[PDB]
Write a protein that binds this ligand. Structure first.
Ligand SMILES: [Mg+2]
Ligand SMILES: [Mg+2]
Lengths: 679, 679
DNA sequence: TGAGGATAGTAGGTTGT
DNA sequence: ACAACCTACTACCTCG
DNA sequence: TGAGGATAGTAGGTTGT
DNA sequence: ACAACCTACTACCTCG
């Protein structure tokens, strides 16, 4: 295909002198000894109380600072039991940089080296591994300061590596009554002047704090005064705050002692649009700069921006198209005779003429007969909705649209719960709505359309796989949801999903994971007529150890090839063009069976965040994976102009679980897996 | 109805003297003060380090011991942050016994008083609030010492209340090598001689402990000798134990230092398998006895066994019948034209024509046609099962039957996962069945036939509700499943179930709770032709506060009456007939709106465990609820001779969640709610 | 509930030595 | 602890 | 994987002051 | 903690 070289935010630092290679090690002995469950954290707690630049190593600690300056004896409380530890030093033994586990110690030694160095400079703001040396913009109340997040680790080469990404931070120092005093609206949240605890503001209130009632038989002005908060400051106006953990019940508070906590929505009254989002040319300009400023401070030598070769993936064409929205009026890759319905409580309304026209123009271009219909909804008793479903059943229903005043989630889901029971997919455009914002109706329908298959574009390129499936965990924080979406066809794709299953954790049961992948193998021969030669195995996030083991074997037994790749948004740094403009689609090899892949980038959203991908299993070339993987990004049909960063099975998959974890799956029998009901 | 009086295991004790009403209270002050997350547990830790007879009382402790003997200053570590506490006494102040919260403290005071008294007597075995004074049965290795579980609480009346239930304990004092020495099979589990930790036993290889190799530069024999456990014992034969938490991989160990942990399976070789379950007339005899022995030790005067008035409930004329097995030969309350299929991997070639005969006759006495088809299944590819369900679907598969060599749970569930995928209920009987021993086949299929939807029996009685629904939380330990089952007609019963939904806790979402009850209200009038005038609201376990609030309101809105009751398996009672024989069905009003209900009892399976029931909401009489409740006990089809203790919606529900919790929910799309697939 | 991303921001979780 | 990843909210932004 | 219950036994969890 | 309740295993038992 094609090629360009890319800078990376990583930097090249000094090769490690010997006295770093050889850390003093200290054997830990502690009373009472701890059962293995508590041992790794007890040691880390020891690494911090011992002090110095020390980190746990195995059943002992390693330390770049000599034992003569470490606190070798003391006490620590972990869980309930309280322990005393002692440390018995030993002469230092070199550590192998090739050995992962010993470089894990020289990496941690490097993290804690860099961090110790950061405290000792002033006047700088340091927040863990993030440093903030400059001042982006100033307001009377506030300032926002600037800098980057750092990391200093050790490579296999035995040299120090530096990672820089610029990040900003907002600093409000005014009280709540002064911030209000400039006629600015109340902040979403708010913090005690005297401490960390953060409230959530509700209303200003009227009462006189000298006269207000407290359960204590004390007064608001008095209670705070007793506790001595208001020697520095004067309380003034009475605020009503409420705890985020439990919003009920409102708790009284004096504004003079609350501090607003600002966001861009509070900052934008004072600064219009403040570019916290950095344009790639400036981000890359700050990264190089700041890294020099570290290196001039650190003494690890001058950094040489690490460069990686890179390759431009072939542009992927949706078809009938440059953006799916362009496709909406004209012919879809596929079209089917279809029916749709309208129901809502403005109330009440009629279907307007403009919506139909768009549907007609597209049906007209493609050549497929279009229907539309009406429905009328009673929500207080709710009985009819089923009766509708039977009438909605024929002919036809394949997706449904609603518009109402926007609802509180508790009300929004409860209506989405009652919606699904009768087997209806649904989409909302909050109203009132106008032709004035076209996009809110163009994409709110483009989602309804996929909500009856399909508004699809499918690739025309040549790809080694001919079936793609996506897996992730989503849903309540307490336990997760494993589900899966799928892409049918090597050249002409199709979109469908699999009911997810409840597990206690991120790990997906091996037995299930294969079961769903199997459920997508049934799909290929549903019309494909044969077993797909090769299937594509992506994973959202990390891939757990051998979670696929059952699944990949069971492919081989049934005669199907495969490749397995990890997709993680979080890892993988940043990618800058060594010369020239930036480009929307890229592959960088990096090392071995891992590569970075840039699925999306616009000149105006800021610097793009590139995917890190490892080839976990399978034989196909990395470039081949990128070549399909990049094109896969485009196929999403509920985004008329924006392309998810995750290819649709993962992205579709992300939606599927999250909606499933907010909605539930109780009522989802009647709904088809043709629907693509989440969007 | 009918009438008899009953004793209760509770005992009348002394009215509290004043010096017990008036406990000393101590106010707590602790540095640092804790957030309210940690305040109740920190105070309890305080009441425990303070010593004496002390318990938490809100902001401060309360104490039956004078401060002058309490430890008023010390340290305590909770959650990894240590605290010093001080206590300041404040005279004493009487506590109201009518106030629940102050009697909660006097109840706690009573608990810790009883417990402090139990330690000070000898030679008794005391295990928390459980005490063991006499020796039931001796083996050369073991003893099974006996006694009762107690509790001592304060009444609204102001007098101490005593609850006694006799319980036994098995204490084995001898090493693993000697217990094997008497030619007895290896216990399922085993414990360290030198400590609490217990292992799970596996095998004992031939390795010679003097030369077996430890992961360290050590040897099994030499290892334990290093730690000096061998001073009082000899190691002898090598054992191979395995950790329960992670069974792989086997861990080596010396039998001379392990101790078998015996159950009634291991005592049964020695003791003619004596069953710890007492006969009701001995257990009753022990309760009175033991309470006297306590009472003569306690100094609260003499206990008077508390009696409660009691009434005999209606005997269900299940139809029609005396036992649902009786129904099997005769006509079912609802025979329907029906089909069955057969598959197995034993593999027996064929259907054996003794089972068929029984099926035909009942369908030939009722007058209902029937068929039994055949199936053949390939498990290596499994594709065919899909072709079977299409054949099976028409017209033969109402329910299915398999028989297979005993399956590990991993393999057992994995096959049942496959079973559902094609919407196939299933029932196993292991190979090898022998016709001669009927019950395993007679009930194995009474489970398969209700898995077709015949309702074997229904009552003839007159009941105030005409629809009964059951709710429980069931599933994995980490997160729970909420499901519901129901009974269609008061006069004539039907059995069906509702899909379950996944939650993080015992609380079932009001929005789901009502949604399910609504799904059983939708069901009733599928053929009822009316709204049910009254519906029955039972709950498994406690009813969380206001879980039902949305549900009960939404009833009253749609014109339906209701009554609400809490059913607690472990709700506390034991009931004894003051005179005469014990009987199967009973109702006792307790002073509160709650009542005890004895759903099942057999003269041979021990003292029965009666149900505690509160009337939470509604207006029907307690007797009426019991009167319906006790009959619903029997409706369960799937037990040929034995009647569940929970009425079938609750019981069916428990089974419903549990299978869902291990099987899953994802495969089960096709299966009908008709099926009753779990059993 | 309009879509996507990338900014700060909240308040966390799991996996695996 | 800890690392490298995930979770699910709100609130800027402009429309390949 | 035979049904239920009641015995001991394991190894825990939730809810609500 | 703590209480009063639940959870899901195995292993006796005999067939309302
Ligand atoms: Mg978005
Ligand atoms: Mg049983």
């Amino acid at each position: 295909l094609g090629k360009t070289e890319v800078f990376l935010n990583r930097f090249a630092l000094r090769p490690l002198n010997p006295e770093e290679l050889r850390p003093w090690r200290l054997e830990v002995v502690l009373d009472p000894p701890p059962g293995r469950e508590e041992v790794y954290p007890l040691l880390a707690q020891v690494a911090r109380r011992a002090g110095g630049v020390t980190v746990r190593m195995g059943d002992g600690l390693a330390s770049w600072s000599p034992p003569e300056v470490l606190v070798l004896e003391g006490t620590l409380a972990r869980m309930g039991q309280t322990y005393a530890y002692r440390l018995y030093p030993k002469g230092r033994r070199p550590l192998d940089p090739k050995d992962p586990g010993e470089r894990s110690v020289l990496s941690a030694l490097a993290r804690r080296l860099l961090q110790e160095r950061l405290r000792r400079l002033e006047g700088v703001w340091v927040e863990g591994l993030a440093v903030y040396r400059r001042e982006h913009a100033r307001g009377p109340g506030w300032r926002v300061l600037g800098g980057a997040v750092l990391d200093l680790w050790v490579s296999d080469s035995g040299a120090f590596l530096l990672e820089v990404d610029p990040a900003y931070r907002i600093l409000c120092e005014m009280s709540l009554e002064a911030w209000l005093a400039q006629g600015h609206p109340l902040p979403k949240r708010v913090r005690n002047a005297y401490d960390r605890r953060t409230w959530e503001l509700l209303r200003l209130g009227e009462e006189d704090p000298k006269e207000l009632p407290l359960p204590g038989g004390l007064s608001l002005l008095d209670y705070h005064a007793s506790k001595g908060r208001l020697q520095g400051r004067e309380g003034g106006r009475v605020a009503w705050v409420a705890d985020p953990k439990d919003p009920r019940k409102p708790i009284p508070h004096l504004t003079g002692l609350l501090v607003p906590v600002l966001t861009l929505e509070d900052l934008h009254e004072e600064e219009g649009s403040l570019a916290l989002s950095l344009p790639w040319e400036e981000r890359r300009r700050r990264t190089r700069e700041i890294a020099s400023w570290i290196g001039r401070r650190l003494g690890l030598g001058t950094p040489e921006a690490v460069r990686a070769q890179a390759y431009r993936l072939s542009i992927p064409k949706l078809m009938g198209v440059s953006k799916p929205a362009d496709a909406l009026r004209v012919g879809f890759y596929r079209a089917q005779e279809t029916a749709l319905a309208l129901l809502r409580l403005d109330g009440a309304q009629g279907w307007p003429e403009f919506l139909r026209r768009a549907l007609l123009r597209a049906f007209g271009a493609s050549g497929a007969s279009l229907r539309l219909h009406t429905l009328h909804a009673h929500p207080s008793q709710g009985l009819a909705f089923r009766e509708a479903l039977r009438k909605a059943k024929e002919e036809g229903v394949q997706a449904v649209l609603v518009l109402t005043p926007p609802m509180a989630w508790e009300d929004r889901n409860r209506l989405k719960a009652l919606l699904l029971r009768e087997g209806l997919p649904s989409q909302i455009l909050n109203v009132p709505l106008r032709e004035e914002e076209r996009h809110r109706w163009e994409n709110a329908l483009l989602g309804l359309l996929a909500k009856a298959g399909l508004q699809v574009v499918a690739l025309s390129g040549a790809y080694p796989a001919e079936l793609a499936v996506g897996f992730d965990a989503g849903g309540r924080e307490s336990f997760r949801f494993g589900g899966a979406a799928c892409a049918v066809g090597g050249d002409g794709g199709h979109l469908l999903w699999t009911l997810p299953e409840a597990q206690a954790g991120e790990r997906i049961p091996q037995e299930v994971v294969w079961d769903l992948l199997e459920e997508t193998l049934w799909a290929f021969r549903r019309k494909a007529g044969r077993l797909p030669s090769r299937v594509l195995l992506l994973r959202n996030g990390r891939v757990p150890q051998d979670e696929f083991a059952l699944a990949l074997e069971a492919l081989a037994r049934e005669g199907i090839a495969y490749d397995l790749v990890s997709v993680r948004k979080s890892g993988g740094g940043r990618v800058y063009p060594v010369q020239g403009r930036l480009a929307d689609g890229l592959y960088v090899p990096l090392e071995d069976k891992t590569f970075l892949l840039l699925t999306v980038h616009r000149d105006f959203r800021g610097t793009p965040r590139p995917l890190k991908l490892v080839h976990e299993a399978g034989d196909t070339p990395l470039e081949a994976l990128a070549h399909q993987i990049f094109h896969l990004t485009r196929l999403y049909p509920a985004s008329g102009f924006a392309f998810p960063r995750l290819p649709a099975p993962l992205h579709l998959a992300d939606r599927l679980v999250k909606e499933v974890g907010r909605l539930g799956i109780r009522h989802l029998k009647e709904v088809d897996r043709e629907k693509l009901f989440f969007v």
